[model samples]
Target: AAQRARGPATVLAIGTAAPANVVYQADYPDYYFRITKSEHMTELKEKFRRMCDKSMITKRHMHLSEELLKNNPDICAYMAPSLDARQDMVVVEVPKLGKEAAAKAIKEWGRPKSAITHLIFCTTSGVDMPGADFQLTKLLGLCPSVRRTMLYQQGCFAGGTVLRLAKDLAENNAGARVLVVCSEITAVTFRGPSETHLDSMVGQALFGDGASAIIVGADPDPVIERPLFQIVSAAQTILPDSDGAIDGHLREVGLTFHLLKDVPGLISKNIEKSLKEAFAPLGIDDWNSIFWIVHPGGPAILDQVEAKLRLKVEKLKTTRTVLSEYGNMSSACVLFILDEMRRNSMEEGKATTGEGLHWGVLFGFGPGLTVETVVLHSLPI
Candidate 1:
């Protein structure tokens, strides 16, 4: 069968934003235990502290402030807010924070709002009638008729999914310039269940609130020094047997997460297969040289992938650094990693993927036990 015809989309620039409240790992236990008065408070706090220590996360940003937690101890103990409050916060803050990141990308790209042909917004944290896409259009002063689409409730992989859509739009529409934004405020659902379950502890330990934006267009100027990543291909897979590995469900208060103990194992078992198929088209047999930007869902997931793929530690330095500095920012995490790679390249006067390191792969995992992969090639800028 003949392959469908498609043009190329180049990632020109990226930007990210963190919440105002930044908390370090050592201090998280104090903030978390402040709201707890349960019988298992000591045990829960100890467990959470241990989890944070092993999370490979040093600091994290949150929309919830210390004063808020202290003032509403009852609310923090339960860790769930009224549905109205959750939705209200999402509507007010998500768009505002997302705009800050998106504006940076626009500025870095040196493009005017009138030149943006489409806006692609992805988020799994909240739901609103107008949605962030509509709100962001007005906030960013985009053209009145700018095309808009939202990938809502898609979980962490939503960023990669939106990136693939942006690639398609830029490739198919000729002059199309697409802006992709991913934002999440996980603190809204920071449930303080007293249960000693590892899933709850790990979830609370690793997640951080963040927003990231990137600009994808047809090409770039050859005189530029920084290299642009060319979208070579994208592939997605769902492991049928691992359907129950990870999930999120909406309740009266807010969203609740469900993570099974065997998640890392499930991901490790199936990753190589999908990755093989993603790279087969390009006839790349060895993966050692390819730059890896796997989402830092947690330490276990990263260690498992490294073991499964037999990749060197240097390849994942950016992933670890992002996890340590910002924690896992959901869909925005991969973009943060990408931004770090770009910055590292600029600082060292070379690419993070190393010498002759033109090819790179991005991986994002989410609720369906799903894996989203995007193959990138460095193009002369």
Candidate 2:
């Protein structure tokens, strides 16, 4: 017990990665409809265009290209029993993208690869034996003895879950350094548009592929390790009776995800109570005083957070900006928001990355209609 961290867990470094294929939302509906042979479905085509118009995303990266889609035409169907078709590609690209992000984080941390005492990997893409965690460990050349944890199919909020676990590990174990990575490839869920399943149409308009990595530990060597955001405490709440809200599973076709339309409403109703309970100890009555780094689930979700908290329009600028730039990258999206917040704060010469605020809250919403709130304290620049 005596060999414990002297301070709270701090985010020492952050890095994010995206594939080279960039698909802008401008003509995405036309391109998707043409490629998927849905041009004849005129009304549905118009519907998708409108959805893309309101999606708030300018562009997105997919580990896919027109050439690859043309070559693997069979998997383009809305429902194709072609798991074997993607098996070869999924396993390789997941870890490869993860390695790219982790390498950047390690470089920023300015530490030897062997210094990572723990590795936590989360991904929406499910894989076979010798999982992404193991492959990432081998690829990054992290210590063989580095204790590892992997969460698959944990949905978009696993970013907060993994970071929460890292915070606990860092403060409880002396000298422990944790590498947290969330990698997602939409290839598993990508499919042609179907009027019957409007749920998927919404996904097509939002989901994007990206990976983000972070280095978390406590009691940094003042000169080398720079603490970006101090992870004060992490807490989560499962919205009652909302198990099917973000339903996802593996099917013969591929990974299937179903999101209910009422999700944003659910969050707006419950979030106030969630935040109050989590922030009780701090006695923060004014929500605007705390910086907000929330998952950009969609434009509606971001609006819900603002409406409920009565926050100024500028409070969620980073979150909205990330949504505007990359769309929703599942679990990896929130860290990209944090990284954006950091850069913007640095550019503006703020006292801290938390928009010069002393207290901040990072929110993550996902399966279970779960709300993950991480209370943060920013250190001076």
Candidate 3:
């Protein structure tokens, strides 16, 4: 019997996984067009190729494999009521993929899975009851009595939003450990291109399926749970007049999304103010000194953030690398960057996993053009 940590909730471990179906960005445009049987849309295919190049992504994983698409043409055909098949696939996949990451996260936490008392699950892959949260618990063999929370449709920011929720739950209930999972599968939205719908092409080129899991608790039991990043503060804000800029909804055609071209510019203009507000309370200046884990919304978003913040390229290294490796995995993106950041930092023999730095921030952007900031303090590795 020892004392519990009186400090803030800390991330104890992180794990991430991407689906096996891989597609290189170089080949994605041609592959996507061909798979969707829209090869005749030569003009749009050409535009998509350029967009894929601009994405700065090398490759991405897809749970909707080529074989699957071939067997079920309706799933890829534009606006087909392929919901029956698509829905069935996710019912099986969403939790399976999430379980892979969650198991890895639990292993690294170095505690029995039975010790986990809270569960928070997130997805954009659609949902069913007895829910994804329940399926994950069943698969992981986690306690049946574990408290659960499921979140969907925060768009790209679900990862941080879940972290915000995890932080509160751990702090509010002493001795609680929360396992957080954010998994996404593109099956819900993959479809053939349409001349009338240019936005779908952007999504087709940019999204890739993946899952991430994290273990969080405030009072680390000294011998078992060494912390990674201490969760200091979490805050959310929305840009004026940009409601639904990153909009989407589920319909018979699967999920329909409208991603405005102006989103990057909107985030660029508002980001500095948001960051200023989040860190100014700590009197933290000098962006270069703090580590950054920004959601790589897309290539353009990264460029604007780097330029506007006047941050060195090295500062955004992990963010850029995650984008290149995985496309936009949406809800899973932030923690994927966190995983990359820590592993790379550990490899470099940095004093702390925040890349040799102590203070840092994780930023997530989603629908409503909402912005999330979670200030962090790194524990020595």
Candidate 4:
């Protein structure tokens, strides 16, 4: 297809939020972080924690914090802007997610009810309603006229998927100023009955409460960055015969995480080929030419990415930093990296995919062992 944006479709404003209760590596008790010299799981445990960027979690919906339990808001409140110019409010719904928190957040921002045209809800967390879409609108007193659409049951990468959809809608439809909200409460259904080290250690260490929002559309506002990243192409690849790569179940107790032993190596084997094929249509032959905005899966996963892609360690510092700071906010993982990129400005941020730095791939992997890839170019300021 021809380039989606023949002209510049600038990212007018970018806003992000995270919960308040942060659990640094030091906060982990010996039972959770207890490591023995000969224990093989110790390596995996440490590696997993290092990769989760938000070591400290904002206690949006968790019971661990007495303070958060007393608070009425979900995690979204911590992230939304106190004051925003855009009157429109858009929400991405993760089923059974941060609806209350999102509403509390939007209201906290002082956004007007008349401004909300669409609630672009993205979900995968659960199937509750009147749905979170309606619940959030009702809580916020959004006009009954506010249009609602849901991206349901997608994986962690669905956040970007929803944003891409919002971009398309804004491009084709005249009145589509979208307020994208995502509340991924991975902690809720996490039921840990099995004593497997991977399940207990990596699962809890990496995931925590997270919510984020960004106003997306093609508008020329000084605050916005143009062509922030041109969406050139997208591709999805499912690793062959790896159905058991990452499995989760919902029994009466709750959600259970059964991770594969070979996930890292499995992904590494295909990284080069996946990029090569995805970039062929754009006439981009050299992988070294683009910047890689990869998901913050964990420390070892990144190590695998670096080794397999033959990239220098510095190429992935930003990713590593995010992982170490926050365990792994699942769907919100990349957003954290994107937030850091925005705060630092792409030029000085040391953001790299390859030589061009301006153009590269943004992709992620999730439960289905699925991969979501997008070829984009950063907008020139």
Candidate 5:
């Protein structure tokens, strides 16, 4: 509630990475489409009640498990797709994406060879024995003496959490520069054709595989360039006694995103409390001046954010736009939004609303219904 920003934080640069593997709506099961058509009521009737329907099928965001395996065939092998495949095949390759991506990312962003003092890799899925931080450092040619850390299984808000942690490192060391990279291949958790395939289909329609890298450092005179928003303050709220709200489990069937039907209510109820608490310390007023980088948990969850914040339906157009295009890339979606804002600023040749404080709020809800937030100010970069 009363969290502080890492002292005088500055983000020198941000670089985002995406996968070459892209899938489209055609890659889904034939039944997935039949649900909407009034004539083909076979699989559709079981999933939804109705005749003709165009209910938003947000699952077209990423490649299915079969699609992913086709690309990364050597990584593992499973049964090939057949008519109504019996199982789904999702796996969250945190280590694969994190380790490989972060290494090249440091140099790819043109950071000084030894400038990376800290590496923070984040994800809510997958486990690696060597850990992404260590593996990436060696693989990506990071500084041999670099420090590394990981934030695992924190869900979508995990990226902002990484930023907050990097800010802490910068604050503690003053001159230190911390490199934070958020990587996730949400398709990794895909279960084969099953009921979970249905839920994960929700994810598939909305999620994409992508990674984002940001370098946070301190500088004198507050050099304002094409900077992404800065960290004004960050708050993480873990709701007590709320484990069942959004749960994940794995078995022979792929992972499941067990979001409760009432998640919208839960978010609506707690968002204001978290917002008041997040802003109180910053002494921030006027939510209008700030942008809401709320994660596109899903369309319904986003509606809850807009409804709770009492903002215009169009206020979150950028977020909604991303949601429509990319579904939910877990922790990576907000970073993409942040990237969008950064590009917009560069093109407009301006920063903020001519300034009082161009503060922004970032929020993501995870399995425990945990809310992670960061109140960031637009530092002219």
Candidate 6:
């Protein structure tokens, strides 16, 4: 089956960026609790603190800082700022971070922007006409006539969707070089507290702001000799009767995410079946051999994937580390995890203790009860 494949797209370079302001869980109370310093909020403060502590996220990046919240107390006054204010912030901040990451990847690619034939930009944070794709092209100095594809309002699975398109484009075109970028400014969606608000509290404690970039092409350049992973195959599945398991909706304040209580259970029940279908075309049966890059949606999500798949803790190390350092960057999260895994493999000179091709699989879950999976193989140095 592997021998029949031809002109597979190869990952050339990857880079990521985060907002300047860092939000630490240790200082969360000072930022959040201080605003509601009333006897009525005491129980809520404890719940918030406990949730933040258990989030496994030590710190995360955000465009809005504690000082900004302190100055504009009206933001989290009754609820976060108006959707217009949030969208305004998203428009300004998303591209800034997106460019920072794209610049790094472009530099690491060591190729001229003129060489890029296509650009795929993905985000769930906000939307605009002549959107981030145009802004990024201008910021990165790419050719004016280069083709661009913009994916907006899609949730976490959008990254995989972006990659799938890039892979197809690069594979079909003899010399195509596709630049893929995913960015999210989830911090702008933060809303005021609710005593019974599970989704709001979980979103506040778990999401963050960041961006990631990578280059993919049909062939590796001689000048850029870094080993590249080949995109083997891609597959996706939407769970039945689970339409409302997870949702992102535009509200008065901003975009609010609603994660139902059964999400973990829904994932656990269907993940293996979804993975098997994803791996079928590649002739992969024993999943234990593949390096796992599951999205660190939260500790519970990771725990569910690990237990249901019966995967070893080591396989999830990178995911856990990324979650601890950056919380969840939504669609961009898996790329950050992939980049970390790539660097570690480069440092160690191999992805695993093997004599043949090293296999890796990436999984992303999001609204629509969606599961997106991509299969990649590490090229030997």
**What lDDT is reached at residue 305 by model 5?**
65
Model 5, which residues run further than 4 Å from truth? Answer: 1-7, 26-41, 45-110, 195-201, 220-227, 281-285, 353-357
| Residue-level lDDT tens digits of model 6 in 32-134 | 6565442368787788888898898999998877666665555575465577767777886788889999989889888787999899989988788879899
Residue-level lDDT tens digits of model 5 in 24-108: 4433444334322223435643443221122232333333444444454322222222212212221234444554445554543
Name the regions of candidate 1 deviating beyond 4 angstroms.
1-7, 37-40, 71-75, 79-81, 196-198, 221-227, 351-356
Better of 1 and 5 by lDDT: 1
lDDT of 4 by residue, 1-381 (tens): 532333433333444455555555554432233322123445554555453433333212232243432232221121222111111111233422344444543453344546656677664455543666776676666679877776655666664676566667556555345566666654343322223444544566566556655555544334322334545556777877678787765333334456765778878887777887877766877665666667766666777778777886555656666665655666666655665565556466444323236776776887777777766666543
lDDT of 3 at 223: 82
Clashes of each: 0, 0, 0, 41, 30, 0
Per-residue lDDT of candidate 2, residues 162-245 (tens digit): 889999889988888899998988888788888898888888889998999999998888887899988888888988768789
Of the candidates numbered 1 and 5, which has the greater TM-score value? 1
TM-score of 3: 0.97
Q: Each prediction's Cα RMSD?
A: 2.9, 1.2, 1.9, 8.8, 5.9, 3.1
lDDT of each: 0.79, 0.87, 0.87, 0.54, 0.60, 0.79
By TM-score, the best candidate is 2
Error of 5 at 287 (Å): 2.3
Model 1, residue pairs in steric clash: none
Query: Per-residue lDDT tens digits of candidate 1, residues 157-255?
Result: 775788788888887776678888989888556767556555666678888899999988775545641336778788888876876788788766677
Alpha-carbon shift of residue 277 in model 4 (angstroms): 3.0
Give the local distance difference test score of model 5: 0.60
Alpha-carbon lDDT of model 1: 0.79
Scored against the true structure, residue 18 in model 3 reaches a CA lDDT of 86
The parts of candidate 2 lying over 4 Å away from their true place are: none
State TM-scores per candidate.
Answer: 0.93, 0.98, 0.97, 0.73, 0.78, 0.93
